From Swiss-Prot, chains A, B:
Glycans are attached at residues 28, 286, 308, 378. Catalyzes the hydrolysis of nucleotide monophosphates, releasing inorganic phosphate and the corresponding nucleoside, with AMP being the preferred substrate. Shows a preference for ribonucleotide monophosphates over their equivalent deoxyribose forms. Other substrates include IMP, UMP, GMP, CMP, dAMP, dCMP, dTMP, NAD and NMN. Belongs to the 5'-nucleotidase family. Pfam families: 5_nucleotid_C, Metallophos. Homodimer. This is 5'-nucleotidase. InterPro entries: 5'-Nucleotdase_C, 5'-Nucleotdase_C_sf, 5'-Nucleotdase_CS, 5_nucleotidase/apyrase, Calcineurin-like_PHP_ApaH, Metallo-depent_PP-like. Inhibited by adenosine 5'-(alpha,beta-methylene)-diphosphate (AMPCP). The record marks 93, 96 as: Transition state stabilizer. Zn(2+) 2 binds at residues 11, 60, 92, 195, 218. Its cofactor is Zn(2+). Its EC number is 3.1.3.35, 3.1.3.5, 3.1.3.89, 3.1.3.91. It is linked to Calcification of joints and arteries: A condition characterized by adult-onset calcification of the lower extremity arteries, including the iliac, femoral and tibial arteries, and hand and foot capsule joints. Age of onset has been reported as early as the second decade of life, usually involving intense joint pain or calcification in the hands.
Length: 524, 524
């Protein structure tokens, strides 16, 4: 048999530096993890030992830390080139700075092919981008070749800023003709590498005839065979085996997010390109693996500009930004309004005639707001100031929630009101009235929400059976602060932009901010 | 006696072209008035006939029409130079584009001295601006000399954008030493030319010893001796005679606004520079005076760029901008919210530790909103679109109103509700609740207003005895739409920026707008 070792990352999300165990800022180095310097060490070790290796990325290198804010993808090209990635699929966040912010720097600077078979362009853009990403690439590996066919979430227009020219086609529809073309070219070993989420990955494995392996991303899915090595709880075995409609067993892999793990899958192929066996597991990139000194020194050189940027003025406030717990855990606070307004602004995407914007609503737990910002430093706001407000390295995500779930969340917000607990909700696009004299669970007496399917935005009563898009911290989407109903009842969840970056961009665009307390939250 | 003819304009406010009788856009040419081409004809006629003539401007050439939006003061320098003005005082609106927007183009391009004795600078700005405006200038007139000493409203920091370096001193305090200096230099004929309003002009005439004549502005004051020639009602005789504390009679003049009139005052002086007599009247620049053909042709050449600008995209809306009367004369409408939010943004001025901004509140009669804007032209908004919404050429002014007056205005807003009348108020920084089942005059059941003297803006009940700053159309400050209580009870009133320009600037800054209906106005 011919044995291939697939090394894979996905949803690295700008974690160029090593991180804490929870993928926030590294504080206690002896317990830090990931980063590209440590990844380099492990990849180099494996390449010394195994003859046939591919290093693949399933997208979403863009977005996640100040690295992306400052270097805008140049860090991705540089460090992925240093790691010698063999191929990458486009993720949704590769469109965060528009198609221009993808073409330059990433597509023009990567030394490896960048792939997606289900994105097409028209008009002048089609000529500008032709050949800069590809549906697939056939790569030599030893004396053999392996075809790698890419794909990107069809939902990218709702989850990034690709513009109005690009069209994202159904993944399976686009993939099948490319995989059949590869068969006619005598390519019998085919990896589908792409960025649509574990559920779509399983459908691709089932339905796209000729795919031998699926290497996915987007959903931050952790798969593991055996006892988990850290705190992530597996969603299934690694690999996850799909029985295909052609009657093959097709392994599906993913490797969590944030560069914490290196995916590692060994596949044995017969002479006709059929998978005989597949086995492996993601490797936890913990501190037992040394950071490569050369990569680490280059990381430290690149960090200088980040340190400089972090103390520069982003914009000004003419109001005190009240992020105190005494305010934000007890009543509407103007820091909460600012952050929710920034969240909504970050999620303005292109709209058809059926909505002014696809999402209009925001919730933010007061426990997530960790500092005020004083306006008496000549009004200046810096990144460092924002990092005191939002210190946990999270994202502001998009979910779909039934009205009944959202009502339960607002009841939870005040179920033990008066104790300065973190679950009290700041809001945008929502007007809530509580009556604290009522029993816990029955304190929400009015709950109105901003329409989306309307040409003039206005507030209407929340409807229990209707599904609402809401922007909220990943912490809450994951059930933090007791919001188990959100985790258990949500109907869709996609990871969004970094928390600080969302607020920084809004402040920079607005130039001068003056958020008020304006009656979004009232008490009878 | 030595006879001097003083020709004077003030508060021309970008009326380069002839206007209608009410100083809006000229529609019926046979009834149009003013403009620089017609002014040229009349000034030239007078200079043919009278030996000793000065042509003076008392400030506020900046701001008022698309001319200023596009040419940013270059039109002021060019056409004032063509008219051969002899001197100009700085007005408050000369600071609308900051000190940089005054230095270039006006101070560097004017061929006449520009004056203000009560503005000082410090640090590098002082060196940059030194000598570009002057406290006074001594001008030869025939075989004599006349000193002209300038002044500018001490309130300019609240009424324009001068920045944080310039200091505006009390006018009388600054003027007296300059006038005494002129006496030591054997200058015995002294005109005070400046921009603080008729009330301050009378105080200057009374208290600044050695001033022979005051030529003022700012308050758009119409003075006339005899039957008025048009619709403006005189505030007093022309000249208005002040008895000075030195026991002289000192004439005070002003000439309305908008270039509709040319002020004309003849003064006889004795050999010692004492005024023997003064008489005159503003000259109505009506269509019986031909427009100078050469100036008119140059105006028409300069208009080409204005026509081009008027159809360019200023920014985008993703929402329908509902300026329909069926909405804005009956309930909160999102066009009204947009315009009030633009009004508040235009009035963000520098603030000390005692307020986040000096003004927080806006009212706008629905009768002033004359069109919607549809978002389905790729979201584009142009100046032409805004001119359909705001077609009357007015300004958004600053007033001080007792709470009791503002409550009466809100009662008036709904006193005959249900008839699609123009007085219904759109708002910003105000939350009102009406109960229409109550008697007219007693329908306002809640009225909360955004604080200014606060570091976190929030809403508090309106207080009847407290004085509030409010931004509102000049139409309403003048008692239009039945708001007689505003005209009769206001405690201060200063003219603001052009209505269209206020909204255009806000849209251009915001780039993408999405105003909602959000509960600023509710009905029980
Ligand atoms: Ca195969
Ligand atoms: Ca004198
Ligand atoms: Zn991701
Ligand atoms: Zn993704
Ligand atoms: Zn004026
Ligand atoms: Zn003025």
């Amino acid at each position: 048999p011919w044995e291939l070792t697939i090394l894979h990352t996905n949803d690295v999300h700008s974690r160029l530096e090593q991180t804490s165990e929870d993928s926030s800022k590294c504080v206690d180095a002896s317990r830090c993890m990931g980063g590209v310097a440590r990844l380099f060490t492990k990849v180099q070790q494996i390449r010394r030992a195994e003859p046939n290796v591919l290093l693949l990325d399933a997208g979403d290198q863009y977005q996640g830390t100040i690295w992306f804010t400052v270097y805008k993808g140049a860090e991705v090209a540089h460090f992925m080139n240093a790691l010698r990635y063999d191929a990458m699929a486009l993720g949704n966040h590769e469109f965060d700075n528009g198609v221009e912010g993808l073409i330059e720097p990433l597509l023009k600077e990567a030394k490896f092919p960048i792939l997606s078979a289900n994105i097409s362009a028209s008009g002048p853009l089609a000529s500008q981008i032709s050949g800069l990403y590809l549906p697939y690439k056939v790569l030599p590996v030893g004396d053999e070749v392996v075809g790698i066919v890419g794909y990107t979430s069809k939902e990218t227009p709702f989850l990034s800023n690709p513009g109005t020219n690009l069209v994202f086609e159904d993944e399976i529809t686009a993939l099948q003709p490319e995989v059949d073309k590869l068969k006619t070219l005598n390519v019998n070993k085919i990896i589908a590498l792409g960025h649509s989420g574990f559920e779509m990955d399983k459908l691709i494995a089932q339905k796209v005839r000729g795919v031998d392996v699926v290497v996915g991303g987007h959903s931050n899915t952790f798969l593991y065979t055996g006892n988990p090595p850290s705190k992530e709880v597996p969603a299934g075995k690694y690999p996850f085996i799909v029985t295909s409609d052609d009657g093959r067993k097709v392994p599906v892999v993913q490797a969590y997010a944030f560069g914490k793990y290196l995916g590692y899958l060994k596949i044995e192929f017969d002479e006709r390109g059929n998978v005989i066996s597949s086995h492996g597991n993601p490797i936890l990139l913990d501190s037992s693996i040394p950071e490569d000194p050369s990569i680490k020194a280059d990381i430290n050189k690149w960090r200088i500009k980040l340190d400089d940027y972090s103390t520069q003025e982003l914009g000004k406030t003419i109001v005190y930004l009240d992020g105190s717990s005494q305010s934000c855990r007890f009543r509407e606070c103007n820091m909460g309004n600012l952050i929710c307004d920034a969240m909504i602004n970050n999620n303005l995407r292109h709209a058809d005639e059926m909505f002014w914007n696809h999402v209009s609503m925001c919730i933010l737990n007061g426990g997530g707001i960790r500092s005020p910002i004083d306006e008496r430093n000549d009004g200046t706001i810096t990144w460092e100031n924002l990092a005191a407000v939002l210190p946990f390295g999270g994202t502001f995500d998009l979910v779909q929630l039934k009205g009944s779930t959202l009502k339960k969340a607002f009841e939870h917000s005040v179920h033990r009101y008066g104790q300065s607990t973190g679950e009290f909700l700041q809001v945008g696009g929502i007007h809530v009235v509580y009556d604290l004299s009522r029993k816990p669970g029955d304190r929400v007496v009015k709950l109105d929400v901003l329409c989306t399917s309307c040409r003039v935005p206005s507030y209407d009563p929340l409807k229990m059976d209707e599904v609402y898009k809401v922007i909220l911290p990943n912490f809450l989407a994951n059930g933090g602060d007791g919001f188990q109903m959100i985790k258990d009842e949500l109907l869709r969840h996609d990871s969004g932009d970094q928390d600080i970056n969302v607020v920084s961009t809004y402040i920079s665009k607005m130039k001068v901010i003056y958020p008020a307390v304006e009656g979004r939250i009232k008490f009878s």
